[PDB]
Amino acid sequence: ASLAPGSSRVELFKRQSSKVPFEKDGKVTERVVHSFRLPALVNVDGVMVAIADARYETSFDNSLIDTVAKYSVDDGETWETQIAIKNSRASSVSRVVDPTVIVKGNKLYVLVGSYNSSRSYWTSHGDARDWDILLAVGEVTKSTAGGKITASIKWGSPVSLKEFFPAEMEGMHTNQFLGGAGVAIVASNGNLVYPVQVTNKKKQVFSKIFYSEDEGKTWKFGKGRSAFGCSEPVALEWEGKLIINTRVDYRRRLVYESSDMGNTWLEAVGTLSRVWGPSPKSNQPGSQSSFTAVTIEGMRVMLFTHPLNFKGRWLRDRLNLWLTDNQRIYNVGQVSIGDENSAHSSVLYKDDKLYCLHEINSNEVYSLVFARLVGELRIIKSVLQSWKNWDSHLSSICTPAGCGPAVTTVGLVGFLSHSATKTEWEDAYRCVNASTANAERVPNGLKFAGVGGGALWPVSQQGQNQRYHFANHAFTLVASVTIHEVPKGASPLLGASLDSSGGKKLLGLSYDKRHQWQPIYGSTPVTPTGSWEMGKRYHVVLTMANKIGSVYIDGEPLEGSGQTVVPDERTPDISHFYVGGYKRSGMPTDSRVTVNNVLLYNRQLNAEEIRTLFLSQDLIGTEAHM
Numbered sequence: 300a301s302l303a304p305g306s307s308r309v310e311l312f313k314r315q316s317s318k319v320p321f322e323k324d325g326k327v328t329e330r331v332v333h334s335f336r337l338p339a340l341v342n343v344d345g346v347m348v349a350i351a352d353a354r355y356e357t358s359f360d361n362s363l364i365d366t367v368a369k370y371s372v373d374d375g376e377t378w379e380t381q382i383a384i385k386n387s388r389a390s391s392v393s394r395v396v397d398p399t400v401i402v403k404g405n406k407l408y409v410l411v412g413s414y415n416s417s418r419s420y421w422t423s424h425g426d427a428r429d430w431d432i433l434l435a436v437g438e439v440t441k442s443t444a445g446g447k448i449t450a451s452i453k454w455g456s457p458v459s460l461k462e463f464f465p466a467e468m469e470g471m472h473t474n475q476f477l478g479g480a481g482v483a484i485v486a487s488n489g490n491l492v493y494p495v496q497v498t499n500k501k502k503q504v505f506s507k508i509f510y511s512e513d514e515g516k517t518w519k520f521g522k523g524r525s526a527f528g529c530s531e532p533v534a535l536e537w538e539g540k541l542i543i544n545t546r547v548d549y550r551r552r553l554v555y556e557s558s559d560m561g562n563t564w565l566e567a568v569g570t571l572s573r574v575w576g577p578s579p580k581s582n583q584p585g586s587q588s589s590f591t592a593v594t595i596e597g598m599r600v601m602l603f604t605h606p607l608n609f610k611g612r613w614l615r616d617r618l619n620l621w622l623t624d625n626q627r628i629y630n631v632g633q634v635s636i637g638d639e640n641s642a643h644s645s646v647l648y649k650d651d652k653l654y655c656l657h658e659i660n661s662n663e664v665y666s667l668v669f670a671r672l673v674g675e676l677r678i679i680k681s682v683l684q685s686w687k688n689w690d691s692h693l694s695s696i697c698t699p700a701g702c703g704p705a706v707t708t709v710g711l712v713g714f715l716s717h718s719a720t721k722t723e724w725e726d727a728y729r730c731v732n733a734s735t736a737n738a739e740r741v742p743n744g745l746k747f748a749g750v751g752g753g754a755l756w757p758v759s760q761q762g763q764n765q766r767y768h769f770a771n772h773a774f775t776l777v778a779s780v781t782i783h784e785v786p787k788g789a790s791p792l793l794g795a796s797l798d799s800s801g802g803k804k805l806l807g808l809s810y811d812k813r814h815q816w817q818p819i820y821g822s823t824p825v826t827p828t829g830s831w832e833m834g835k836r837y838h839v840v841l842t843m844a845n846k847i848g849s850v851y852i853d854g855e856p857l858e859g860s861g862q863t864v865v866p867d868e869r870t871p872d873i874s875h876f877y878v879g880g881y882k883r884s885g886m887p888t889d890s891r892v893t894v895n896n897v898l899l900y901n902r903q904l905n906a907e908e909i910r911t912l913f914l915s916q917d918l919i920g921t922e923a924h925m
């Protein structure tokens with residue numbers, strides 16, 4: 300339970316306690332609600348709106364559900380309650396579901412699925428007999444009446460958008476669709492954009508972008524789609540693309556990019572795709588996720604939440620929040636408390652305060668808690684100042700022949716330099732440390748010695764959540780090194796390992812008893828090349844892209860460098876990077892070397908940025924700057 304220092308919370312929508320105005324046959328009554336689910340928390344012009352399911356009788360998905368809203372004009376001290384949308388009232392189990400919310404001006408656009416009488420889960424329905432898809436538009440107006448600031452919201456009659464759903468898509472016959480739940484966006488050209496989950500007559504699930512250029516009068520689907528198996532998509536716009544982050548049951552979450560309103564989808568292999576696991580071993584159901592772009596203290600970042608689900612199934616305990624600038628991926632920490640069940644969530648950033656509406660579940664009775672994320676916003680601002688300082692400090696270095704090109708920070712993701720503890724080498728970017736053994740701190744890095752010496756920067760080793768999954772598609776690992784002793788055989792100095800030992804490599808660099816380098820390319824025959832001297836430091840660059848590895852000493856490729864390291868159409872799964880040894884006592888090499896300033900970029904640096912880092916190795920360390 301990390302609800303941070305100075306952060307606190309209330310139980311806003313109290314299961315079996317909070318009442319709503321329930322309407323039926325021309326009569327409104329105050330009704331105690333069983334469970335509140337599917338939190339959507341937004342800002343309309345300074346009115347904090349909280350939208351959710353009111354699951355009246357039971358938390359069963361297929362039961363009687365209206366869309367409730369609660370709205371506050373004082374940043375969630377007091378709230379007014381209403382029912383935003385009501386179901387058909389056609390049976391005891393009629394329902395409007397997966398409320399998905401777009402804010403635009405003083406308007407709230409809410410899309411829901413609607414079901415009349417089925418008790419089966421929607422993905423199992425072989426047709427659309429019980430289903431409709433409805434947009435209701437709520438309008439917020441703002442008074443300062445009788446002295447104090449007041450507000451209300453008038454909700455419109457839902458309008459069916461079923462006319463806008465084609466009966467065919469590529470290679471399939473359509474079935475039903477719903478919003479991804481949570482909060483959607485207005486694009487920077489003004490369009491309304493819902494990422495939606497859709498099923499076909501084969502009952503497969505897959506995600507699309509459903510949009511409107513006309514304030515919601517009419518609706519299109521992007522031509523493209525996600526893989527099958529992708530559900531509850533949640534989307535934001537980042538630097539002119541849509542980022543569509545999807546739930547994938549029993550798998551790691553797939554993230555996609557689309558630069559043309561969803562006409563073409565490319566998997567975001569270089570950044571965020573397959574980063575987040577739905578459970579420790581990613582073999583459990585996943586979750587709805589809050590996924591938004593904000594500007595905090597002048598930097599555009601993204602915020603993402605998803606339960607860790609230690610418990611497995613749909614329990615979905617331990618809601619975590621993540622920060623990213625589409626390069627570094629920082630775990631802010633756990634928002635929910637202890638081991639409580641805590642599946643959906645909605646993060647709002649408003650007037651430079653952070654808030655989160657999330658579920659808590661005990662025994663299938665759900666409340667939505669409203670939390671003030673003050674400590675979290677503090678951690679975030681600190682991590683961001685850190686990102687800003689290192690990028691600015693690296694980028695103002697005057698690189699030598701006054702000045703050559705700046706040290707590149709585009710795509711720099713991790714940085715091991717001057718800070719280290721007794722057993723860890725610290726990421727200056729503060730997201731992923733390397734563990735160490737037999738490590739002696741020297742300026743801007745470590746000196747390693749003896750069997751099992753070295754550092755380990757985890758890749759797949761990060762566990763359920765893998766920030767460095769990009770490395771499987773491209774990376775550049777850079778480092779200054781010095782060999783202090785002539786090894787007895789070939790010893791490692793640096794590389795990306797595919798297994799836990801370091802014995803099955805993707806790409807690495809070793810050095811041998813003959814004073815030669817042994818760059819290693821996958822499982823290819825190793826060929827010693829070049830020459831070094833005990834005591835001279837050297838600059839080393841490993842790049843991999845397009846399934847091609849290359850090794851540089853002092854800014855210059857080794858002879859025969861640029862070989863195939865991925866020997867077929869399967870994607871590697873890198874376990875970790877090893878630095879200055881294997882950091883394994885089972886591996887019988889002894890690397891006696893010093894390694895300074897390890898940089899990890901999410902791309903193949905080009906000739907010039909490699910030559911700049913080389914000539915700049917003495918200027919980039921963190922040493923002076925702490």
Ligand SMILES: OC[C@H]1O[C@@H](O[C@H]2[C@H](O)[C@@H](O)[C@@H](O)O[C@@H]2CO)[C@H](O)[C@@H](O)[C@H]1O
Binds near residue numbers: 358359360
């Ligand atoms: O546990 C509450 C959640 O149930 C999920 O439905 C599961 C169900 O729990 C499981 O026991 C079995 O029947 O499979 C269902 C999926 O087809 C719902 O998906 C989820 O939304 C919660 O209500």
